[PDB]
Symmetry: D2
């Protein structure tokens, strides 16, 4: 009954999707491809995690396979995704978590080796994009190549849904203060396409472009063209925050806003959108599996139509859990 | 050159003194700090993790601190009232401690025979200035005055240009702020401000700030039209303001760029910077601007609703302003 | 006569909170009272519940009827600056953990006896109290000793390793560096530290050399090494976990594989839980929340020759030490 | 002044260039990087998170990089053997890419008409030099050489003074070293060196290093008598050496201080520094010494067994030594 899954790119997201799948039992990981991490290295990289701690389970190399909690995983080492024998390994869905194959054309290479469906762990220029709790019911069986959007979109869209559903968003500008990621550099280094992203990640606050707010208008079509934003990368290793400045169509007191977010967090968006009035800081959300946790005490309203709302997200662990949730929902529809 | 005294030799005290000797706009003659003896003052002024070693000379001679060959008198006097300023020849005096922010508690410097007191911080009830915005509203009647905060000094110059040209209907500000001395290394006690106790290396920390409201006190027309909040992040210096605002008259982003650029080259030269370069925070380390507009970092949704980004070295910009203020108060004497 | 000793904690800080956490996790002692004039009851709930380094408390914690209630156990809360005025006896606290950092002499720590505590355990080195390292000299504790010290995090890392090396090969002389995480004594940005100037400098920006008596202290808990060790520290910008680097000359020849064998044997037997052993390609975060006093890193050390070696051992300076405070108190209880 | 080509405009190539223009000791006339276009070189050279904005001018002009008014020929060759150094007039080439560290690979620059190559890293086969210690062993027969590492350049000058005066029987070195470009921001792949893949911001990371053993090549009397290891820690620049050594002759700590201080003022001036100040790592940012002995930080167990501490700006000290080595080579012809 559980869908069998293959992971392309055993990185932060590849490893934590694997970790999430084994922790939740919602899907079964049967194959991993990563040309830059051999089998014995995968054991080490999966077992020890600077951010989320040692894996709670067993991992070893046995008979040329990676065995997680007694479950053997076929390991591939292919640079070219069209050459990965997913079908032979029994992988039905492929998580595409390399960062380099994000178009439907590129991600579609996995169909050549026998995958049935591909879930891109990032925004896509052209794939249908999903955020669990917001538009995952728009998924249908005709969609072989889909995107789970970004961490930032998965934080903003559940909050935006609640605000838009209750009061309407006329227009919104978003900032995300975002943890450093593997794309950044330790010291000033080369990033020919994006100069600021080459600058030393430990030393700097680094402004960066993001399509994450615009993307919310693709997962919530009524908000198409009504949102945009940007990011600052800062020197923390995990956990990020969204700051949405928006104008509301209908007036809302800040306590009205709190009430509808809290109600959504306790009912239909349970496990997706969280709600806190605690005096939280970023490390309080390390390994928190929500997509989005609204911080009641941190936001501020100028008036009943113009507000700044704050939501936290563990950019690694919330998203990884969402990738697994999406695949479980896809499988239920087969 | 007016002759100046400093109460506290903390980051602002030291950096005002540094700015005073580097600019040569004013001239320091006295300092007071109980948690800090003369020999220790030499070391704290000479070496600085953030801004580097002082360019010049500093020594203890005859019980005075001597900077670039200039003797300075050193009080230890635990109570501001008890501060023999006039003795030392301190015309104006900078209140850098920030537990004497009110006008009464900081009136105390008048008791010691000091003429006029520039406070290095927001005040509940004193007249706040920001150079380039409302300093031309200083006349001689004024004693205890405020130079506002670092963040207000970043936000107000940009707000002035944007309001002057397009009108700000309303705005909400975020500052992403480097760590400060009020934060803790590891989770520790901050009983009035619990989030501020949490370890500063490990955390993004949301914080209240009155800086955006305060803009409405130096720019009366923006009173009640701005508020905001902050995030403390684990960098050692240089902060950024993110102002999201709704404009009355429509403005293409290229028009916003044009007016900010004009202002930076003209009347706000030295105060409001303008760049289109692909900058990051450390590029503004020891930059003496109040506010530098980052053209490439900002983003418009439409002609009425825009997000504008401005950098400030929270330590250094402000310190230079406190000196600039005194040079300008000296020309009004 | 004495069963599970009841404990009071003076100073609810990193160590006071994590000793509390260790006591509830291990069950070895019962925390019945806490004193901190800088953290009121509602604030204690928050500071205990959420921890940047070690994560949310796995249990329940709340305030009710003026008590702190942890895992349903009510704890009496005091707010006294002067330790002679804390009513430990009325609250049922028998041993007191003196974890403020400002009462480390037998005379200052002994203030707790005035309010009815029976014994005091100073969570730091002491100029005059008997000092103990679990696994090394705790069996030298006797019930005549009412005020004692559990030494420092660093001494608890070095001593168990120094014991094994000395016992097997003989240490002629040794010099130790500890590369140590930042602590609450340091500053976020350059600020005043009148007696220790370097310690005022910004903790996030700098490597900061600091004196430490931790190596010299090993010669007090292992008398045969008296005057044979000393060392120093560098503070670096990590929030927790530290490492000891011991360079020593050995009396008998020791191949590195022999050193590894005897450490592994000690870690598996008499020093189990105290001294660990690994050959894994570890880094500091791998020991976050690790309860060992000392984990020998086989791959990180290096021998110049059979008599001159550099040995590396990791320690969670918060969590290893806090567990050791609990362990020592339960040992003390067993000897009443 | 000898004319110099720089292969690779990473951190070393950039700071060698900066050292060259700052000191004036050599004339940079060409730079090769296949990966980094001219406009991007301007940006990478002008702005530096660690050392600040370049003190001077830099611009693109007529297809050349122009620094302080000096045009520099820019190449974009993947294959070192194809770089036309001769046509650009580059006599010596600094091989700073990190991937051409053997004599076979480094020697490709000679095919394009370079006369000598200086590898800005340890080499498995090129002779290694440390200025102040064995640079007088350089001779005109040596067409391809190495300037060793930043750590060897720190340890060797201190080891030389101690050995010369007291004799080193045996020594073990630890270096607590700032992060570098080879590390990762979060846990990532490093297949030959698993610990070095782990997040550099989060971790103390132990690493093997031949830097201490290498001292036995530049000081042959110490062959087999020194080794050590490194800890990478989350600071962005400046490192420190901790040398634990047994001495043949007795030495009071105060005798150690005297001989290091004399060395710092005489033959090793500018190379080996000496301080009794209460320094921390940031006090050495942009310091051009190879090695600064920290008198206050070290400790003696006895007259024969000591721990000595010496700071080094791994970037700036080393880059200045590459320039100084080239000036010394130029002095021989
Ligand atoms: N905070 C986050 O990291 C985050 C959150 C949500 C989504 N994502 C997205 O998920 C993707 C991966 O994110 P990440 O942080 O884990 O980066 P990452 O660098 O850790 O992932 C790359 C991994 O895939 C492997 N890989 C690289 N090229 C490959 C190839 N050609 N074939 C197979 N494997 C290859 C890498 O060696 C590495 O193990 C990115 O698109 C990223 O933006 C990231
Ligand atoms: N890595 C470590 O933190 C570590 C490891 C081993 C031992 N120790 C030792 O344990 C002691 C505490 O270490 P720490 O890191 O937790 O420091 P800390 O600052 O976190 O502990 C101080 C706590 O006690 C409270 N306190 C202060 N003065 C008090 C008083 N007069 N009465 C009652 N309570 C008071 C503080 O408000 C604070 O809550 C120190 O001596 C320290 O060196 C610390
Ligand atoms: N001893 C060795 O065997 C060895 C091995 C690897 C690296 N290294 C050396 O690297 C040194 C300096 O490092 P850094 O901190 O400046 O690193 P860096 O990454 O900042 O500089 C490397 C630069 O070389 C450039 N580069 C890469 N390939 C190139 C090519 N084919 N042609 C021209 N340029 C190219 C890159 O653009 C990059 O900017 C030392 O760490 C170390 O000595 C040495
Ligand atoms: N409105 C506000 O936001 C607010 C609130 C409180 C304080 N403050 C002030 O506090 C300062 C913080 O800036 P900082 O970086 O200089 O902090 P800081 O900690 O470095 O400044 C304190 C310095 O003054 C010295 N000092 C302390 N008490 C003193 C006294 N009674 N008399 C004389 N000197 C004393 C300190 O020992 C220290 O050297 C102001 O810049 C300002 O922020 C402002
Ligand atoms: C220094 O820093 C060392 C050698 C890095 C690693 C190391 O430290 C001690 C022992 C080892 C093996 C450098 O690599 C510098 C590099 C950039 C930063 C980095 C820390 C400088 C500028 C360097 O010159 O590159 C050449 C080299 C091998 C050494 C180097 O100094
Ligand atoms: Cl865990
Ligand atoms: Cl309009
Ligand atoms: Cl936990
Ligand atoms: Cl400079
Ligand atoms: Cl002797
Ligand atoms: Zn309305
Ligand atoms: Zn300077
Ligand atoms: Zn004027
Ligand atoms: Zn022997
Ligand atoms: Zn026992
Ligand atoms: Zn001196
Ligand atoms: Zn010479």
């Amino acid at each position: 009954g559980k869908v069998k899954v293959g992971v392309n790119g055993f990185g932060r997201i590849g490893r934590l999707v694997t970790r999430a799948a084994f922790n939740s039992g919602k899907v079964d990981i049967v194959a991993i491809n990563d040309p830059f991490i051999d089998l014995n290295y995968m054991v080490y990289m999966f077992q020890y995690d600077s951010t989320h701690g040692k894996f709670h389970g067993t991992v070893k190399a046995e008979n040329g396979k990676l065995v997680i909690n007694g479950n053997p995983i076929t390991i591939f080492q292919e640079r070219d995704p069209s050459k990965i024998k997913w079908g032979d390994a029994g992988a039905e869905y492929v998580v595409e978590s390399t960062g380099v194959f994000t178009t439907m054309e590129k991600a579609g290479a996995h169909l050549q080796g026998g995958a049935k469906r591909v879930i891109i762990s990032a925004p896509s220029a052209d794939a249908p994009m999903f955020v669990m709790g917001v538009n995952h019911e728009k998924y249908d069986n005709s969609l072989k190549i889909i995107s789970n959007a970004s961490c930032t979109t998965n934080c903003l869209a559940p909050l935006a849904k609640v605000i838009h559903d209750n009061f309407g968003i006329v227009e919104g500008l978003m900032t995300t203060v975002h943890a450093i990621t593997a794309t950044q550099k330790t010291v000033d280094g080369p990033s020919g396409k994006l100069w600021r992203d080459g600058r030393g990640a430990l030393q700097n606050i680094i402004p960066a472009s993001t399509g994450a707010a615009k993307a919310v208008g693709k997962v919530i079509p009524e908000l198409n063209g009504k949102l945009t934003g940007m990011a600052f990368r800062v020197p923390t290793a995990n956990v990020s925050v969204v700051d949405l400045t928006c104008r509301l169509e209908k007036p809302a007191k800040y306590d009205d806003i709190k009430k509808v977010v809290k109600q959504a967090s306790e009912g239909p968006l349970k496990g997706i959108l969280g709600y806190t009035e605690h005096q939280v800081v970023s490390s309080d959300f390390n390994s928190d599996t929500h997509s989005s946790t609204f911080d009641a005490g941190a936001g501020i309203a100028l008036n009943d139509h113009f507000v700044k709302l704050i939501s936290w997200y563990d950019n690694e662990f919330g998203y990884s859990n969402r990738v697994v949730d999406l695949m479980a929902h896809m499988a239920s529809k087969e």
